[PDB]
Design a protein around this ligand. Structure first.
Ligand SMILES: O=C1CN(C(=O)COc2ccccc2)CCN1
Ligand SMILES: O=C1CN(C(=O)COc2ccccc2)CCN1
Ligand SMILES: [Zn+2]
Length: 140
């Protein structure tokens, strides 16, 4: 689990969004596994605006932050998981590391702020749903 809190937005994995998320929907994209809902209180996170390929992510199934190198956001085939069929996921970044289903929502961050959230796992990789192209998260 986990979310990004930027201004009056909550960014979560689409597959973990609550009824309250969907009832307060700003934007959602199944292909990216992302959903954004509205908040009352302002959030503590800043979104990275950059093309960094190195950063640190939080892994709940290890209670640890890991430094990783990761691929640029691309359209990637993902093997079936507990929460999705085998399918193509877009805007996805891969790194070598540990990721289980419960790790979804862990933040990947760089020097410029939050890059993305954990979205995929298995076969010794961790995948992150990028948010750095969502410039609209920074206003309104
Ligand atoms: O037992 C299972 C079966 N799996 C699946 O059902 C894959 O599809 C989905 C589809 C919809 C919702 C959640 C998961 C993955 C591996 N474990
Ligand atoms: O303390 C941390 C962890 N962080 C997170 O991403 C928390 O996310 C997860 C994912 C699943 C459940 C609970 C937490 C922020 C930076 N360091
Ligand atoms: Zn960066």
């Amino acid at each position: 689990s986990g979310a990004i809190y930027v201004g009056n937005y909550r960014v979560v994995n689409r597959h973990l969004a609550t009824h309250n998320d969907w009832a307060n929907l700003v934007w959602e994209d199944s292909s990216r596994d992302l959903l954004v809902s509205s908040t009352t209180a302002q959030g503590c996170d800043t979104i990275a605006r950059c093309d960094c390929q190195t950063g640190v992510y939080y892994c709940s199934s290890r209670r640890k932050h890991y430094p990783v190198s990761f691929s640029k956001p691309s359209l990637i085939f993902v093997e079936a998981s507990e929460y999705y069929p085998a399918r193509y996921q877009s805007h996805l970044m891969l790194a070598v590391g540990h990721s289980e289903p419960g790790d979804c929502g862990g933040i990947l961050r760089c020097q410029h702020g939050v890059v993305g959230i954990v979205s995929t796992g298995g076969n010794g990789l961790v995948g992150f749903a990028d948010v750095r192209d969502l410039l609209w998260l920074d206003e309104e």
